[PDB]
Amino acid sequence: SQIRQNYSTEVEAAVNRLVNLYLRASYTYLSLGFYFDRDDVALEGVCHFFRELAEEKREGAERLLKMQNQRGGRALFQDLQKPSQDEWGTTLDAMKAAIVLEKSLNQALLDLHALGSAQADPHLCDFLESHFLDEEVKLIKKMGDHLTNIQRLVQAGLGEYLFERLTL
Amino acid sequence: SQIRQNYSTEVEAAVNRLVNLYLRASYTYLSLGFYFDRDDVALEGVCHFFRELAEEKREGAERLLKMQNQRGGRALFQDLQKPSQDEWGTTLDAMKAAIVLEKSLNQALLDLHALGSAQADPHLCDFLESHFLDEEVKLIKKMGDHLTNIQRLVQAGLGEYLFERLTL
Amino acid sequence: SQIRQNYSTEVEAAVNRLVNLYLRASYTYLSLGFYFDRDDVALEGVCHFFRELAEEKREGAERLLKMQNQRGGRALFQDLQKPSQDEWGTTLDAMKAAIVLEKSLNQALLDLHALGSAQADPHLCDFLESHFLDEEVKLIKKMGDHLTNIQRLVQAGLGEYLFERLTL
Amino acid sequence: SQIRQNYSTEVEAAVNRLVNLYLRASYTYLSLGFYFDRDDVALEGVCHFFRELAEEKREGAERLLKMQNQRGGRALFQDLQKPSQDEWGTTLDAMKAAIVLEKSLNQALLDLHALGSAQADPHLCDFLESHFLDEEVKLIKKMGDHLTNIQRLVQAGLGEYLFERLTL
Amino acid sequence: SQIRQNYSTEVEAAVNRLVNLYLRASYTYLSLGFYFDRDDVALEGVCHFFRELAEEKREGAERLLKMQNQRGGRALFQDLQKPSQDEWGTTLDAMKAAIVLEKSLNQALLDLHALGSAQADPHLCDFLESHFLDEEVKLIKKMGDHLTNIQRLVQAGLGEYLFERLTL
């Protein structure tokens, strides 16, 4: 506020909503990760893949919160909604759900970028491009590649085991 | 379930509630940490203290979730309630709030231990004693020590600055 | 006896029975291990898994015997009963048999812990919690995870080969 | 001119004006730095803070001049106006003056970015975003944090000494 | 007794009394040290200062006991009287109490030296001069220096905090 410059209330609010989305995504990946650690599921490579994504999403939320403060905006937190499912089915189901999740985050990033451009806020625009847009694009490509390999593999039980052992 | 042995539905449910409490506590510390990173608050040592506590609470939740799976229980997640405050006042106010938070987690741990003892579940009892009860006791002692030093210091502005520079 | 303190004859006898169980379990794993070393079975990773478990069970028996002496109890040995089977079938059959074995040892540990608590013998209680209860819980979780992966895999012959090569 | 492409005369002129602003800012920080080196002021940490900022501003001017040449524009220099004050008062006064200075440079950067966007000059836009916009935002946040701590501290004499010793 | 030479019963008895004084002093410093470790006192540097003094006094008692045996005297122990206070007030109160304690030990050393001289026992005299008299003089000087700095500092709460952080 002594520091705030060119930082609209609209962008400030949208940044708080994006923090919530990232935290929610981290929570979803925590649930996905532990589901694959169940003794009756037991796919450790899948569990590790999702645990790593949970950490990345949390880090994304923290970078947004740091930026909110750097701009003189005020962080506001909301409840984190529990993940959409309690049980996540097969590795295939889970990877589909993850791609759906990432494309929603990506669309939220693109909406925020468009807001930033409309508000002539190039710092916000650069920030997103630099730390988030390319990371989402790479992550979604990786997930699409996984989904394609899982699909080619599913003798569904054997396929799911080999994917976990040899890719993840 | 092929593995589940001596693990009551009551303990299983209470472990899921304790995971929620730990995650909520981690979220509260995330909010505390960023509040002290505000340009109009600007106490970096306080921000770092709370960020480190956020990570410890998240790690606590993950150890409980791992244990839930080791016992053949089923992790169930609920919404994470937003922190009780949007703005946290002085370092003194914040430390008081943190001690209140930790004593609530501690009481939840003690309740779970008592449940475990009533259900004759010594693995649960040892698990809590080994990874959580002593850590809470040490953390609460550290916070009480901080609160005492903050209180002796508050020329409140000068006191709060020196505590952040020389203790934290 | 010059040293014996708070160590009931009931716990002393039950410790001797638990030593017998551990030695018997070690013997069963020796038989399992060599069965998978047969030229007409030939699953070396499975043989190694069971040989390692035989050593762990023997070490468990020795720690109990050391503790018996530390408390001033008197080690008494009984015949070791030969393993329940001469031939152990598939890796799946063998893993099921191993989980059954470990859950019996675990239940014997829990019974001894309950005896110790009834006799107000906290050293015995801590000893079991510290060296045996968590190890059994981790081992049983690992076996349940293996059983789940074996089951998803069984083209039974191909499944059994890949599990041995890629997991064990 | 054999190299010039998509580089408008408007952007070229505005880049020369921004070079002048950066050099003027470097000159102001040189004056601030030496003022705090006076034997009757004697705050070495404050002097060092401003000397480091003088060097950063000069480096900023040189990067703009390099870019002007890379684009085939022609560097033109104007007089550098002497700093607005001969004596800079307290550390608080000086930090306020520095924040005012940086917010003026920042607004000049944002104006140039908007000009670049209107002229469809994405190289200029990326250049500013990459080397200047985030640096200004971080610097202004740091200064706001300092100002807040100075204010909480001012027993004004004691406060100013401790800030210089313990923060700077 | 086969070894005893020039070692009077008076010096032997006085050495046993001095051992008691040193042990009592060590006990007093143990109580002082833990008092400053209380969560409602919480001055860790003060706690460490007194814990180190407790160890020095115990070491002093052991050197006297070793010397008693080297001379062929017979160590005799008495009850160790509990410290004069249960709660020690401020750092200032505690440092005053410590200086009073050390000056009493010092006077006991000087009395013993005078006894040794009267009994023409130069080994005892050298022993005290070499291991105890200069150490007491240095310790008392250090405590007097601390007391002076504490006094100049006591905004008593702020003074006590800064002394603990910056001196101890």
Swiss-Prot record, chains A, B, C, D, E:
Keyword Metal-binding on entry: yes
GO CC list: autolysosome; autophagosome; cytoplasm; cytoplasmic vesicle; ferritin complex
PROSITE patterns per record: FERRITIN_1 (PS00540), FERRITIN_2 (PS00204), FERRITIN_LIKE (PS50905)
Molecular function GO labels: ferric iron binding; ferrous iron binding; iron ion binding
Domain Ferritin-like diiron: 5-154
Main location: cytoplasm
GO biological process, one term: iron ion transport
InterPro entries attached to this UniProt entry: Ferritin (IPR001519), Ferritin-like (IPR012347), Ferritin-like_diiron (IPR009040), Ferritin-like_SF (IPR009078), Ferritin_CS (IPR014034), Ferritin_DPS_dom (IPR008331)
Residues that, per the record, bind Fe cation: 52, 55-56, 59, 62
Subcellular compartments: Cytoplasmic vesicle, Autophagosome; Cytoplasm; Autolysosome
Origin superkingdom: Eukaryota
Entry keyword annotation includes Transport: no
Pfam families to which the protein is assigned, alphabetical: Ferritin
SUPFAM superfamilies for this protein: Ferritin-like
Oligomer and partners: Oligomer of 24 subunits. There are two types of subunits: L (light) chain and H (heavy) chain. The major chain can be light or heavy, depending on the species and tissue type. The functional molecule forms a roughly spherical shell with a diameter of 12 nm and contains a central cavity into which the insoluble mineral iron core is deposited. Interacts with NCOA4.
Its biological purpose: Stores iron in a soluble, non-toxic, readily available form. Important for iron homeostasis. Iron is taken up in the ferrous form and deposited as ferric hydroxides after oxidation. Also plays a role in delivery of iron to cells. Mediates iron uptake in capsule cells of the developing kidney. Delivery to lysosomes by the cargo receptor NCOA4 for autophagic degradation and release or iron.
Note: In horse spleen the light chain is the major chain.
Family: Belongs to the ferritin family.
Protein name: Ferritin light chain
Lineage: Eukaryota, Metazoa, Chordata, Craniata, Vertebrata
